[PDB]
Amino acid sequence: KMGIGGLDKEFSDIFRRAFASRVFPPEIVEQMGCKHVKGILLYGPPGCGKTLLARQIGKMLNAREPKVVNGPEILNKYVGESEANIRKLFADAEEEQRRLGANSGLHIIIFDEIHDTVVNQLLSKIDGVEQLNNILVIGMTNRPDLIDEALLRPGRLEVKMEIGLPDEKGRLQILHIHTARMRGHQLLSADVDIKELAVETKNFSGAELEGLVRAAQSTAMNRHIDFLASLENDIKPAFGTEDYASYIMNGIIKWGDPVTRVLDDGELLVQQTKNSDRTPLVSVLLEGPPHSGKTALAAKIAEESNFPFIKICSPDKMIGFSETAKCQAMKKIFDDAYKSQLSCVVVDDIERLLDYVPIGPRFSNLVLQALLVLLKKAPPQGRKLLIIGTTSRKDVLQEMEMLNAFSTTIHVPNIATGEQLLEALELLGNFKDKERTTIAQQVKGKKVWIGIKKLLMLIEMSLQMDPEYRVRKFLALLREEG
Amino acid sequence: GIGGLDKEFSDIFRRAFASRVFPPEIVEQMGCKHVKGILLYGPPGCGKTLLARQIGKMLNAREPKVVNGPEILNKYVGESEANIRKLFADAEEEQRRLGANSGLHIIIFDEIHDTVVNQLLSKIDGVEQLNNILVIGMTNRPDLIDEALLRPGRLEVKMEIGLPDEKGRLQILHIHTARMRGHQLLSADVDIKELAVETKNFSGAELEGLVRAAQSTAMNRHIDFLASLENDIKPASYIMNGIIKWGDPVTRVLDDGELLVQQTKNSDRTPLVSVLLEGPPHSGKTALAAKIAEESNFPFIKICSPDKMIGFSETAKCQAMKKIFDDAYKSQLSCVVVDDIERLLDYVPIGPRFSNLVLQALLVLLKKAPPQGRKLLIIGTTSRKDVLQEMEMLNAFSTTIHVPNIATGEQLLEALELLGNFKDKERTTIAQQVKGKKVWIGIKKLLMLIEMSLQMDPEYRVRKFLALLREEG
Numbered sequence A: 001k002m003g004i005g006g007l008d009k010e011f012s013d014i015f016r017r018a019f020a021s022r023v024f025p026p027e028i029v030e031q032m033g034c035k036h037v038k039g040i041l042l043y044g045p046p047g048c049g050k051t052l053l054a055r056q057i058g059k060m061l062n063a064r065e066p067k068v069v070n071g072p073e074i075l076n077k078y079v080g081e082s083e084a085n086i087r088k089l090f091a092d093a094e095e096e097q098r099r100l101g102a103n104s105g106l107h108i109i110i111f112d113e114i115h116d117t118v119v120n121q122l123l124s125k126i127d128g129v130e131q132l133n134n135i136l137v138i139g140m141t142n143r144p145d146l147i148d149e150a151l152l153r154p155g156r157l158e159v160k161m162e163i164g165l166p167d168e169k170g171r172l173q174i175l176h177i178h179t180a181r182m183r184g185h186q187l188l189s190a191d192v193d194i195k196e197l198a199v200e201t202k203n204f205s206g207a208e209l210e211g212l213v214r215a216a217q218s219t220a221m222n223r224h225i226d227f228l229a230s231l232e233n234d235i236k237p238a239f240g241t242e243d244y245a246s247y248i249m250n251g252i253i254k255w256g257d258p259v260t261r262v263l264d265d266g267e268l269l270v271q272q273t274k275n276s277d278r279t280p281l282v283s284v285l286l287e288g289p290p291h292s293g294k295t296a297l298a299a300k301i302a303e304e305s306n307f308p309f310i311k312i313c314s315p316d317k318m319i320g321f322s323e324t325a326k327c328q329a330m331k332k333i334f335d336d337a338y339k340s341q342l343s344c345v346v347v348d349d350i351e352r353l354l355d356y357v358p359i360g361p362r363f364s365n366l367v368l369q370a371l372l373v374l375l376k377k378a379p380p381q382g383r384k385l386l387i388i389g390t391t392s393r394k395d396v397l398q399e400m401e402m403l404n405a406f407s408t409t410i411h412v413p414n415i416a417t418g419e420q421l422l423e424a425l426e427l428l429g430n431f432k433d434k435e436r437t438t439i440a441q442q443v444k445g446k447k448v449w450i451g452i453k454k455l456l457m458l459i460e461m462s463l464q465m466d467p468e469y470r471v472r473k474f475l476a477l478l479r480e481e482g
Numbered sequence B: 001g002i003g004g005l006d007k008e009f010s011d012i013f014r015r016a017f018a019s020r021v022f023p024p025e026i027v028e029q030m031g032c033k034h035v036k037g038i039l040l041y042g043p044p045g046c047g048k049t050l051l052a053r054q055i056g057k058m059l060n061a062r063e064p065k066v067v068n069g070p071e072i073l074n075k076y077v078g079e080s081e082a083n084i085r086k087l088f089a090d091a092e093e094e095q096r097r098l099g100a101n102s103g104l105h106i107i108i109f110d111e112i113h114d115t116v117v118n119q120l121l122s123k124i125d126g127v128e129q130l131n132n133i134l135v136i137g138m139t140n141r142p143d144l145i146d147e148a149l150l151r152p153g154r155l156e157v158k159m160e161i162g163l164p165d166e167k168g169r170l171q172i173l174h175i176h177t178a179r180m181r182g183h184q185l186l187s188a189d190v191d192i193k194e195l196a197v198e199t200k201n202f203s204g205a206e207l208e209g210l211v212r213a214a215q216s217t218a219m220n221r222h223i224d225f226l227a228s229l230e231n232d233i234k235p236a237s238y239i240m241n242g243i244i245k246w247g248d249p250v251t252r253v254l255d256d257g258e259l260l261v262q263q264t265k266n267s268d269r270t271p272l273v274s275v276l277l278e279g280p281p282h283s284g285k286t287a288l289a290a291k292i293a294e295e296s297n298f299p300f301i302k303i304c305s306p307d308k309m310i311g312f313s314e315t316a317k318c319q320a321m322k323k324i325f326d327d328a329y330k331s332q333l334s335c336v337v338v339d340d341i342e343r344l345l346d347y348v349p350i351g352p353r354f355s356n357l358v359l360q361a362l363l364v365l366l367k368k369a370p371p372q373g374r375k376l377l378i379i380g381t382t383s384r385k386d387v388l389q390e391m392e393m394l395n396a397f398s399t400t401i402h403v404p405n406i407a408t409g410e411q412l413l414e415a416l417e418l419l420g421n422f423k424d425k426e427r428t429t430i431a432q433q434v435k436g437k438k439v440w441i442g443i444k445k446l447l448m449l450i451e452m453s454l455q456m457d458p459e460y461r462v463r464k465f466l467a468l469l470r471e472e473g
């Protein structure tokens, strides 16, 4: 009954159904009058530890199959030839079966990362022309959609299994075996708790667990020459299932009353998400003058939300990509969003993302489509997502039906009031307590239209110059910017 | 065992086999040369293969059956072509050695250019003889295959099969089940007739397969029924909310849709009817279309989603449309629901940018009808009826249905009521703020704003609702 964390109900049903039909001895099958199942296939999110489950299932099934492993290339050797190899590993099993065919020989073959002749070749051997039963094959792959339709139909690959999101209980099981083995030996860390580690991590793949533990062992080794495990949690992954420090370089200072209101509105939106059975997908956008500060805000809302899976989207990664490539990466993030039950994703600089250009205007249709469908597109039942898009220009986006898509729109306006500007200055703490007073004297009777990103940059600009100069220069700079 | 296909199968069977069967002077009295081959084209899952193996078995004590790999032509250098010629060669050799009477060889090509075309054609017919053998070809689509083979002679008879007859389906399930019956063990809950009524599409093969999954399932249990559970799981998502009926128009559209269905299924005169939904987003029309599809209970109903097609090349989108639609043809009748009509095009108002090629593929097919003995209904959802008419595609669609989201206050409250989110008091206040006035919001944003309001404290919910609805106007 070991070892595989979580995946017990689904695994149990699948297992008993594939193995049991074989297991009942021996008249029952004839009583059943049913030919044995040909293969079982599993598709999972990456890192869900599909492979370990498969090796284990194969081991459990027979005293010794004894396991057959297929290289990823599969088809290596061009001249004839490789195709023949894919046929050939099957060939040994079929040969044994013909030599002893009736009962009772089983051979297990597994293809990891599963066109022309090879498609057909696998299909012919797995089913027909005559027999080819008494063996089973399991295929493990990250995405269902990529694989061929013909294999799927009941028969050659009758049963398809989709791996469940990793269990908390399960997470406790995988960590529990390594930890326990350590427990069994006298050495252990008192501070570390199994339940606690499980509650702390939701996203991680199996693999991840051995990795975290291994890093902890290494740090411990370092101590000899929380603790090590904590250091590992802090660094080691690389999980693949969010750095906000790269999107909030400058702190969400409560510069203006509007700032607090934009964030509370972000709070309102997350709260909207929390249940939202009636609406599965939450779409939100921030619209601001350039240098608006909308995007840091979006990132901050995401940090605040702490939904189980958050992945940042960057214009910068997209740069220099083919329009199709741009669509593709974006697609991959979209499916990644699918995995979490409650989830938040960021789309940023969408005008920039689109490659939208003022002259023309010229823009990317394919990119626009991926973007358009997504808001409309529905996450698998259960699991939900909120999308935050930061857009510099509201009207063009409204113009392409993009605005229509969003559930909520938030516009971030640069404060038009000097005193609020002052409040901002005070929070940033750039100017001396004298300078704040001076700015306060100047602002009255004057109207300011400047962005926080722009304001902070402006401030910073005024500051470098000498102290008598800073007050005058900043005022002049403000005047020019106005 | 072969489910359904007893009349058609019987006639075909008789015509190929009987002409051979009458012994032996009768054929000369007929004075007709024996038929060369029989070819069958079926929907996927039509169990063509089993019928063929069975037919071959039935025909001779032992042919004994020849199977052709899908590649057929594997080995480039000379060579493969020669192989396609060569399997024929053994049969011709036997026939020359004993030619007159009485040797028959059966060869079957599953999933049936240059030299191979000619090669198969030359061996099957001419130059001299080549009779005393028969070949059956099994393929999913008729249109793909070559014209030359089809003409009477080399492939005189072409058979098209409409899935498995209900009585027949009962026969195949009945044999495996009966064998199960004969032994003491059986499932009381499972009924033969019931299984037959439940399944229309499935191949024989499918039946042994289903039984297999269920047996495997009994097999799951010891250390309707199982079949029902399989229907429940083994192979809703689109409309998680379900549909409220706020206005007589909302209900009226689902009813009109039901009427379109009735017409499509019921009436011979028009093979096809097109159902069109007109709304401005964020309209719920997409949902209405799904509903329409569900009440119909058409044997095959498929709703196609752009996201499934997302990021595809022009050709790929077009191919998907072709595939779905080919799938629909094969069934006696079907309802196909088309979604995001603007998006398939990838129309963008700036530009204009759109893909013409895809537009022609949809436009041409829509007018197009399945082969006789079958009828279909196509439903599409369009954001922008005006742009569509401007294409002139709209003229092509059989019927137009338009709902402008929610337009009156009565319709609004009726929706809030069917959804049941606000308290009697709250709705009593909302009505006092909308009744008489004009509103204009699609159903889904409503489902959204409602949730955006349930988020505020028990007293700030109503006010927040009226604020949101005040913006979505």
Ligand SMILES: Nc1ncnc2c1ncn2[C@@H]1O[C@H](COP(=O)(O)OP(=O)(O)O)[C@@H](O)[C@H]1O
Pocket (backbone or CB within 6 Å): A247, A248, A249, A250, A251, A252, A253, A255, A258, A259, A260, A262, A263, A288, A289, A290, A291, A292, A293, A294, A295, A296, A297, A298, A390, A412, A452, A453
């Ligand atoms: N209320 C706010 N919303 C967004 N960003 C803010 C806010 N207040 C302060 N910031 C700061 O603004 C900066 C980000 O500006 P950015 O997101 O690039 O704006 P834009 O997208 O309008 O160009 C961050 O460095 C962050 O510390």
